[PDB]
Amino acid sequence: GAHTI
Amino acid sequence: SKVFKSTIAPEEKLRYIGNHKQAFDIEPLYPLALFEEFVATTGDCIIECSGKIKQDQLYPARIDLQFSDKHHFHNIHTSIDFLKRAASRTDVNLNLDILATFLAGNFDYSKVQNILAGIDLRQNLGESKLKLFIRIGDYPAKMAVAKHLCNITPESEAMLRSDTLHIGFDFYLDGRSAIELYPELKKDEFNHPFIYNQLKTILSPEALKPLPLCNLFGIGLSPANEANVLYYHLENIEDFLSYFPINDTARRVHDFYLQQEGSRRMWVALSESEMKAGRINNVNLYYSKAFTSQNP
Ligand SMILES: CC(C)=CCC/C(C)=C/CSP(=O)(O)OP(=O)(O)O
Ligand SMILES: [Mg+2]
């Protein structure tokens, strides 16, 4: 769930 | 002794990293210990562990930390302090000029949306690198600077969106550096009908086949890449193997994370050529766990 807005 | 309180102990974050090190036979590489002492000092965050697979070789010393709060100035400055402490080793040299260009002037930290700091370490010192990611939104002057550092044509520059842009910086320990831009589309967008038939004019059906599994899709553009990198954000880790025929080396990483507590989402990254192949031999896999204090 990393790198998303 | 402590001033700030959390339901999360530093040991929980280090255990998640330690499970990864034990599973994939990671022995100490510089500056992994310095990175773990930095991890222990953070507040709420997501920790992402990754493996890069090239045929039968696994490179598993890949960890990113995503800050979950809004203290963007603080989080960028602590991350840079980590870069400068790593660079104090006399035979390590980091070229920070690309990041300096991006952050020059009166940088508007209220335009920052997301920050990550991370590592990808190798047995050869000079092939190891440190990482910083910054996502910005509606910031015309710095989106222009990022596009210029990335050295893409005016055609491609036109296809990037203006509302949000994820940007990565790589710093190799022998002084090489690179920027990467990750333009993206969410589920609601790559199912919008003007969007999809346009996707079919730049990407093969093989590249498009996994989109029903994803809620986010993107492409990595960087002077350092030998070809554009496709990024798929799957909603459900249990759907992965039905659509991605990975080799046995990659399967060892995925089979481990199918049974670790954490997020049920996952990233996979690979070139378009790999999506057209019968079997995937060159692929990155990413898994994560969230650390959020429960005290209101
Ligand atoms: C926002 C989008 C579309 C993608 C970002 C997601 C992501 C998993 C990024 C880091 S992959 P990267 O750090 O670029 O990996 P290497 O080149 O070091 O193999
Ligand atoms: Mg990259």
DSSP state of B5: -
- Distance in angstroms (rounded) separating the CA atoms of residues B144 and B46: 29
CB atoms within 10 A of CB B182: 19
What CA–CA distance (Å, rounded) separates B5 from B293? 9
Pair B229, B182: CB distance under 8 Å? no
**Where would I find the H helices in B191-277?**
193-199, 205-208, 240-243, 248-257, 272-275
Write down the experimental method used for this entry: X-ray
Ligand 1, atom 11, residue with closest C-alpha = B269
Q: Is the CB of residue B286 below 6 angstroms from any atom belonging to ligand 1? A: yes
- Which neighbouring-strand residues pair with B246? B280
CA distance B206 to B272: 8
Atom of ligand 1 at shortest distance to CA of B284? 19
Annotation: binding site of B for Mg(2+): 180
Position in ligand 1 atom list of the atom nearest CA B219 = 3
**Cβ proximity of B168 and B179 under 8 Å:** yes
> Quick one: which ligand is closest to B270's CA?
1
What are the residues whose beta carbons fall under 8 Å from the beta carbon of B284, sequence distance 6 or more? B50, B51, B52, B53, B62, B267, B268, B269, B270
B52 C-beta closer than 6 A to ligand 1: yes
Residue nearest to atom 15 of ligand 1 (CA): B284
- Burial letters for B80-113: b for 16+ Cβ neighbours within 10 Å, e otherwise? eebbeebbeeeebebebebbeebeeeebebebbb
Contact B288 A4 (CB under 8 A): no
- Our answer on whether the CB atom of B48 is closer than 6 Å to any ligand 1 atom is no
If contacts are CB pairs under 8 Å, which of residues 1-5 in chain A contact chain B?
A: 1-5
Residue of A nearest to B231 (CA): A3
CB burial string B261-278: b at 16+ within 10 A, e below: ebbebbbbbbbbebbeee
Measured by CA distance, the residue closest to atom 5 of ligand 1 is: A3
DSSP β-bridge partners for residue B72:
none
Closest ligand relative to B234 C-alpha: 1
